[PDB]
């Protein structure tokens, strides 16, 4: 009904399908495209409910802020009472942790950890970006590792998880150097506020480390030639982007570099799928 769409509006059903597809992606790579409908269904829904829980627990803590910032949303627009939402988040979470027991121990561990981070980020680490950047980096990388841990060969997914964590956390800092003026006025603590271009040296450091781990699926004789070529074009571009921002550390370059890194991050994800297709 019309009341149902309000609940689908709260959980952000599109964003959840997106994270769940990211979950199945990790499962495909790990099983080498050898799918089991029963394991595929658990992976799609554990990621869906944990994501639905994160999205719901965020709207609860941001109700006082969304009465200004983002109005017309289910909670600040009276559509759902605060207690209706609180009861709902408990249910979505119980499903996420129970369904993961049916995958294995590691899947339950990743689910519990995601859940703790999702609550802590929504509660306090959202406007304290030094810890909050890592939370976004880890939570993004973890959706692949989820499906990956359900598979027979998790080694290529572990490289994908680590590389995602490092390049997203790094990009988050580059993003906070572009957002420095709006952050300071809002009373938000970030690395480019606490330090100068020094934060952009640490941003470079993660981008570099991820680039060192990236040729490992080839080195470990897991992925083929196509992976190695795709990763070589991107590894060079990743370091080139960072080198340009260190040259001109201003708002405009931080903006352009942030956009480019989003592209060459997708080309790397594609490279992992292409590498897995070639069995």
Among 256, 272, 236, residue whose Cα is nearest residue 163: 272
48 half-sphere exposure, CB direction, 13 A CA radius: 14
Give yes or no on whether 1-151 and 154-279 have one common fold.
no
User: Do 162 and 40 meet the contact criterion of CB atoms below 8 Å apart?
Assistant: no
Breaks (C-N over 2.5 A) in the chain follow: none
- Token duo for residue 115: 């859940």
The residue to which tokens 């931080």 are assigned: 254
Fold exhibited by the domain 154-279? 1.20.120
Exposed, middle or buried, 248 (CB in 10 Å: 0-12/13-18/19+)? Answer: exposed
Architecture label for domain 1-151: Orthogonal Bundle (1.10)
190: which residues sit within 8 A by CB, 6+ positions away? Answer: 129, 130, 133, 173, 176, 179, 180, 183, 199
- Token duo for residue 33: 């495209």
245: which residues sit within 8 A by CB, 6+ positions away? Answer: 174, 200, 203, 204, 253, 254, 257
Experimental method: X-ray
1: which residues sit within 8 A by CB, 6+ positions away? Answer: none
Among 216, 233, 111, 209, residue whose Cα is nearest residue 156: 216
Domain ranges of the chain: 1-151, 154-279
């Amino acid at each position: 009904m019309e009341k149902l769409k309000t609940y689908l509006e709260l959980i952000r059903v599109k964003n959840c399908i997106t994270a769940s597809i990211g979950g199945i992606i990790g499962y495909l790579i790990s099983s080498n495209f050898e799918i089991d409908i029963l394991k595929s269904l658990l992976v799609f829904f554990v990621v869906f409910f944990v994501c639905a829980y994160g999205n719901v627990i965020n709207d609860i803590f941001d109700i006082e802020i969304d009465r200004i910032n983002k109005p017309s949303r289910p909670l600040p627009s009276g559509k759902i009472k605060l207690n209706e939402a609180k009861k709902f988040s408990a249910i979505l979470l119980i499903l996420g942790l129970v369904l993961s027991l049916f995958i294995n121990i590691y899947a339950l561990i990743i689910a519990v950890i995601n859940a703790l981070f999702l609550y802590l980020y929504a509660k306090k680490y959202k406007k304290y970006k030094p810890i909050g950047n890592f939370i976004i980096g880890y939570l993004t990388g973890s959706v692949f590792l989820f499906g990956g841990v359900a598979g027979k060969n998790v080694m290529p997914v572990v490289i994908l998880f680590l590389c995602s964590l490092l390049s997203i956390w790094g990009r988050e800092i580059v993003k906070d150097f572009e957002d420095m003026e709006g952050d300071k006025k809002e009373g938000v603590i970030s690395l480019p506020i606490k330090y100068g271009k020094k934060s952009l040296y640490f941003a470079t450091f993660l981008v570099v480390l991820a680039v060192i781990l990236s040729p490992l699926p080839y080195i470990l004789k897991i992925f083929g030639i196509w992976y190695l070529i795709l990763i070589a074009i991107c590894d060079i571009l990743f370091i080139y982007a960072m080198a340009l921002l260190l040259k001109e550390p201003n708002k405009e370059t931080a903006s352009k570099v942030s956009k480019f890194l989003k592209i060459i991050m997708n080309i790397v994800l594609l490279a992992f799928i292409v590498g897995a297709i070639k069995l």
